[model samples]
Target chain A: DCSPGIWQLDCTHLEGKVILVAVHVASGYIEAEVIPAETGQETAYFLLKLAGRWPVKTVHTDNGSNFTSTTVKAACWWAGIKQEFGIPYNPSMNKELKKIIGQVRDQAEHLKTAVQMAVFIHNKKRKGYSAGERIVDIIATDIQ
Target chain B: DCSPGIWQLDCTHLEGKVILVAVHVASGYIEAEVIPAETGQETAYFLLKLAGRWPVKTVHTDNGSNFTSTTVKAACWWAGIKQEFGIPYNPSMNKELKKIIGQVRDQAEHLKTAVQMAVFIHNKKRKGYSAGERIVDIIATDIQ
Candidate 1:
C-alpha cells in the first residue's frame, strides 16, 4: 500500500560538485535544502534530520556509493525509514531539483537562498495535474 | 555499421549550478569545459567546438530547453552532426563525470582545476572493463 509520506533520495552534480536531495514522491513536497557530499554520511545526516522533522516512511534511490554506504544504512535503520534501490532516475520527483538548479544556474552564489525560495514556491503550487492544494497542507492536516 | 565516432551530450548540475557536457562515449574520451547558460546558446557553442575538434557523427540527449533551442539546432545543422533526444540519462557514458564529481565534492573551491584532473585521470583508465585502451587513445587513432 502507498503511504502518504513515501519519499525518494538521489544525488546529482551541479557545476562539478555533488548534491544529495530528498523528495516526497506522492505529495511532491521536496526538502528545504540539499546536502553536498562525496559519501553517504552527509545524506545520512540529512535523512536523520528529515526524519526528525517529518515522519518519513520509505525511501527509494539508485545504488550510488552514497546510497550504499554504512552511514546511510544506520541512519535509515534508526529512523525506521525503509530504504530501497532501483536505477537512479525519477523524472517526476527530480524535475523539482532541475527546476531549482535552472533558476540558480547563473546566480549560483545564492544557491542556499534560492533553494529556500524555490521550495516555498513549490509548496504553494495550485495548478496543473499535480496541483490543487499544497501537498504540505494536505500532509499537515493528515498528521494533525 | 557502427559509427566509430559517436558522441553523447548531457547536462548536469554541480554545486547547485548547471553544466552542459559532451563526451565521446566510445573511447571514454571526455571534455572538461562546462557550458553555463540562461538558454541553449552556451550548449550550442560547446557542441560546435566538440564537432570542430572531433569527427562526431551522432549526438544524443534528453529534451531539455538547452538542447531544443534554435541556436543548438542551427549549430547541429551547420556541423552536420545528427542529434536526437529522449530522457537523456547516459549512465555508463557518464561514470567519468560522476567519478570526477566525487573526487572534488569537498574541495569544490578548486573545482575547475579538479575537473581537468578528474577528466585526465578518466581518459587514462588502464585497468577495468573500460580501460588502458584510453577513450582518448581510441578516438585519436580513429580520427588520425
Candidate 2:
C-alpha cells in the first residue's frame, strides 16, 4: 500500500522529554529517539542521524512550528529530501504513527529504552512488504 | 464517562467551507454549522448560538489561533462560560469529535445538510446519559 523511503515524523512528550519518531511508510518500520527538546535544530539533527541509517527520500509531518521551521527546511533541502505537510483537520494522515505512540506510552517505563524496545517490537511484528526483509537485515547488521 | 454541560468545540473543512462542531461531553450530542470563514468572530458567534440553545458551562477546544483570539475570549467572558484548551500532541483529547467528523464527511453530499443529519443521528443513537433525554426534548420542542 505504500512505498519504501517515505517516512512520517512526529513528536510526542513522555517522562518530561520529547520523543521524536519516524515511521517508514511501506514497512511500518519505526525509529525513535528521546530528544532534549522539540525544536527545529533538534529535529534536523535527528533526521541527519536517521539519514545515515536509512535511505530517506521523503518526510511527511504535521504543521507544527518546529517541523515547518526554516532550519528543518534547510536541512531537508540540503539532504535532497522532500518535505510534505499533512493537511489540517486530517487526523487519518498520521493515525498509524499516533497508534504506535500510544503503544509506546503504554509499554515503556524509561523514555529512551522504551522507544528502542517499542521500535524493535513494532518492526518485528508488522508484516506485509519487502521492507520487512530490509528491516530484519538492518537489525541483523546492527547486532553484528 | 464525561460530565454534562462540558462541550468540546472543533473546526473542520468541507467543500471550501469551515464547519464548526461542538460535541456535548457526556451525551455525544453534536451541533455543527458551516461558517463562512474560520475566524475568531465566526467561532464566537457559533459559541453564542450554542449558549442560547443549551446551558453551557465550559467549552474545551484546541489552541488554534481563532479559538484563542481575543474575540473568542471576550465572547466567552461575556457569556460567563469557561474556555479550556487541549494540550498539544494530545490527539485523544478530541477523538470523539473527530470520529463524528469522519462520519459526517463520509455520509453527506451537501455539507450543511450532512452535518445536521449526522448530528441528529448521533444524538439519537448514542445512549448512556440524561443528556439523551434532554436532546430528545430539545428536538421535540424545536419541531413544536
The top-ranked prediction according to TM-score is 1
Strongest candidate by lDDT = 2
Q: Candidate 1 on A97-122: residue-level lDDT in tens?
A: 66965774554344543454355445
Candidate 1 off by > 4 Å: A84-91, A104-108, A128-133, A140-144, B1-144
Candidate 1 colliding pairs, count: 11
DockQ class, candidate 2: incorrect
DockQ, all models: 0.01, 0.01
Query: How much is the lDDT of residue B89 in candidate 2?
Result: 33
Interface RMSD after interface superposition, each candidate: 23.1, 26.2
TM-score between predicted and true chain B, model 2: 0.71
